[PDB]
Amino acid sequence: KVNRSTALLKSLSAERERWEKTSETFKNQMSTI
């Protein structure tokens, strides 16, 4: 279904943004360990 495809597309784009934020947080934690 097209609606399901669009919903999962926007959800996975949000996941991409969240997980690149997680990656940069992981890079930040190296400075403090």
Half-sphere CA count of 25, side-chain side, radius 13 A? 6
Looking at residue 1, its amino acid is: K
Q: Which two tokens stand for residue 33?
A: 């360990």
Question: How far apart are alpha carbons 3 and 10 in whole angstroms?
Answer: 11
Question: How far apart are alpha carbons 27 and 33 in whole angstroms?
Answer: 11
Max intra-chain CA distance, the chain:
47
End-to-end CA distance of the chain: 47
User: In Å, what resolution does this model reach?
Assistant: 2.8
Helix-strand-coil split of the chain, %, nearest 5: 95, 0, 5
Q: What Rg, from alpha-carbon coordinates, does the chain have?
A: 14
In the 8-state DSSP scheme, what is residue 31?
A: H
Question: How far apart are alpha carbons 33 and 17 in whole angstroms?
Answer: 25
